[PDB]
Ligand binder design. Sequence first.
Ligand code: HEM
Ligand SMILES: COc1ccc(C(=O)O)cc1OC
Length: 393
Amino acid sequence: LPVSDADPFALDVLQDPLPFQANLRDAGPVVYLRRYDVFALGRYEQVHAALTDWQSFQSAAGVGLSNFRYETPWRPPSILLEADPPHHDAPRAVLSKILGPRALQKLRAAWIQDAEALVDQLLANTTEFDAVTDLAAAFPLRVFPDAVGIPDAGRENLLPYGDHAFNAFGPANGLVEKGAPRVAELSGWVNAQCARDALTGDGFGAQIWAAADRGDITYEQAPLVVRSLLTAGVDTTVNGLAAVLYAFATHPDQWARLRENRTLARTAFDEAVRWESPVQTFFRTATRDTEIGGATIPDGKKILMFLGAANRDPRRWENPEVFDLGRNPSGHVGYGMGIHQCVGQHVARLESEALLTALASRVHSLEIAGPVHRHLNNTLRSWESVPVKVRLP
Ligand code: HEM
Ligand SMILES: COc1ccc(C(=O)O)cc1OC
């Protein structure tokens, strides 16, 4: 069994993980990370299988490094993400309906128009702007919390909260050790927003509570289902949108493709999720000795799954380093796979579609105009700044 002291959460890896991915995949199906006493999987075949194999590889002992058999979680674990069947079943079914294609039909017009308003306002203002601040971050922060049905006061808390959540999956470091003085402030505010009386419209929050009335989940599950939406909903989409915008800005070939064929706007996002894999890593815990990739993972030990590495595995993907709108990216693992596969994927897709729709209409050319700054995070490839300059037709 290959053994290595490679550190996936060293700052150099986090800055640029591609060498690490290649080393990982090359070495074998399974690499023992001596530093963390976890078993790493980087190839598409094993990552895909580990993800779907909930029976052998559970989520309730944590999907971060921390082992909940022994270690105190930083917050009450997600009753979706950090739950196994049968406990997972009813909260999952509630969100899978509420966030599913048919349910979002009612929001498509509105999100597309909102994006048009945002893009037209921005371009009226300037042809030189930050793609992160002015687009990737602006847009989800309009439409998503609205659709959930939370108030406008405090929305600035969503990103630091999500950032903390993603950091928490990794080891203790000045990334993860981000607050304490403010973490409790953030947790106090998110939880408050989950209460039935905090929520408005017949938005997603109210629909969770209605499902509870029908007995699909309990009233004590309801706020925690809402909470899932407020932890996973905003930070993933901002950073995913920052990534697709970065990819276009540095791939003028693929921008020209989108312009030519408007329909690639609906599926550009998924190639960007494969290519970038915003969510890089998740852990599982072995429920028993499992023989995967020639290796036996001892019962009780953790696997670390490298979604990025799998999404760039040449065993599965032709020229995987290429950002290619002509790829069929179906079967990518950027949203995971199996029973825990991103229940929010349709929302993220619609957000991307709306924003790309509106931008491709108005923007001939797009270039990097300044240094880009990544925000380092243990789990989520995240973005501080992507300065761009556009040319209008
Ligand atoms: C509004 C947007 C989103 C929402 C509301 C959302 C919500 C969720 C939720 C609640 C889960 C847990 C489901 C379960 O355990 O059954 C999940 C899983 C996941 N999401 Fe998302 N998500 C969103 C966008 C994204 C994006 C853009 C990505 C990646 C770029 C992403 C990556 C994932 C991954 C990798 C998992 C799998 C967790 C696992 O296998 O343990 N999500 N999402
Ligand atoms: C994909 O990542 C997540 C999924 C669900 C949750 C959740 O709070 O349900 C949180 C996540 O990251 C912080």
